[PDB]
Design a protein around this ligand. Sequence first.
Ligand code: ATP
Ligand code: MG
Ligand code: MN
Length: 534
Amino acid sequence: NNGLTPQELEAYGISDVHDIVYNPSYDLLYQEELDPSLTGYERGVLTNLGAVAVDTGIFTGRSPKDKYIVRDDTTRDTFWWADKGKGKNDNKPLSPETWQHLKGLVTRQLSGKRLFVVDAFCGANPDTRLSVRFITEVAWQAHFVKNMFIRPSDEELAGFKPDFIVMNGAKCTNPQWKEQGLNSENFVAFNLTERMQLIGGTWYGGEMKKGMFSMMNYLLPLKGIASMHCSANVGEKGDVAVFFGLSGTGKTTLSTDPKRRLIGDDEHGWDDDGVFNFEGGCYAKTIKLSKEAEPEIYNAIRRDALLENVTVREDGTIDFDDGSKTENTRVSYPIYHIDNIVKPVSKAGHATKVIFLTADAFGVLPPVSRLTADQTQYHFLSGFTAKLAGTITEPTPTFSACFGAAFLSLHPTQYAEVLVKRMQAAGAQAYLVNTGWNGTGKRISIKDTRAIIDAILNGSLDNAETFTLPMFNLAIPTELPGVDTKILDPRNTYASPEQWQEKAETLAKLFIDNFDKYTDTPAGAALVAAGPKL
Ligand SMILES: Nc1ncnc2c1ncn2[C@@H]1O[C@H](COP(=O)(O)OP(=O)(O)OP(=O)(O)O)[C@@H](O)[C@H]1O
Ligand SMILES: [Mg+2]
Ligand SMILES: [Mn+2]
């Protein structure tokens, strides 16, 4: 029935829907979250910055072990399954039967309640975008999807017909999990035949964000459109730059550059016209957030922005440095909270600069180096980054294909293939930047990192004289405008170049061991030459 009547939700299996809050405004959401009635995790608090902060509960990040995709006649022969001959991933198969069981738990949990329904888009271009309908019973959750996805116009809602439905049943869990062979009572399931996503047990909003991203990572490459885990911005001359990288590497902090127009900060596609954003907002990290170091992001934290897991003092002030509940404190905000952005549609032309961000805890890789075409692919499939696990003692490596393995629905080489095709057609140049550590035991400052990005974007790096770094065979500059020459050669940051050597051999070996699983095909076996060598 036209409009968005309760009888329309009955088709989804939801019953006794009393009140339906359809596409709530930011003001409605504001009063909903501050309602003194609210108890538990539904309760939001007001901070001295005018933004409301919520607690996501026990889950303060994604839960890949609870992710499942229904294996049926639609997904069977196309999906990159975790139990298939292909690589290690989180795409665990699920039977249609267990799906229906999980669906029953969700629809029942959402029956006889006041439901928030947010209609939106995933993808800036109408020809490849997904019309998604989110259903929840928690206000701050509908707020999160309002911030993160593309907010439709009144005229667009008129002819709005969803392609995908996501039902968030955070308050319910699956008690029959042991009998079904699942990881736990919690669940994040997808069914491509019904085009739905179910969430149970976990309150974390990121599951809906990354969940839709995973779906885009499935549909687009099959159409020849690159789907990427990267930030992106444009210059006044129209030069587009994409920044790939794993979590915590700098895609958001570095693309948020006042001198350039922000396209997006995390999920983009690349078609015949160019690079386009999937989202309608940004999701910044807030631990130890410095207003001096990252002023644009700090000023975005105001009414309508949603703080997550941050610790708010009695006086309402936020302690950004406190990571007691989690180091993964975040804040989402609609994109317009950033001044210099592409308006009204988040898209631009083909990218000409392709930057790979990595936080090397081993202190081996150089701050910046220009990559050859074969090294571009080698490093893309490698997806290296290292944290520093050890209360930061003993660096621990992470190799995540395409810089976002956790969101891949297809085999990694399928993404590399479509990426290489787009880069070629545009004569794009690739670079590798170490936003991490060096022999000093301290992470490179944001100031130094921004200077390096400018040199890459302004061309002064392309004109610089370079020499080859041994083992990894990376072309590194002799000098660069704005940055200290001493840090350009990673070996200079150690007391003796012998220290670098030893650590470099360790890292090189890890890379070689990791890439070995790709050498099954001639193309990948050919790429081994583009990797490190002892
Ligand atoms: N030199 C540096 N370069 C970049 N970021 C730095 C640097 N030094 C410190 N940081 C901090 O590291 C983090 C980089 O975070 P960022 O939010 O950009 O990750 P991201 O790539 O967007 O990951 P995700 O996909 O999870 O959003 C921020 O907390 C930033 O303040
Ligand atoms: Mg980010
Ligand atoms: Mn991300």
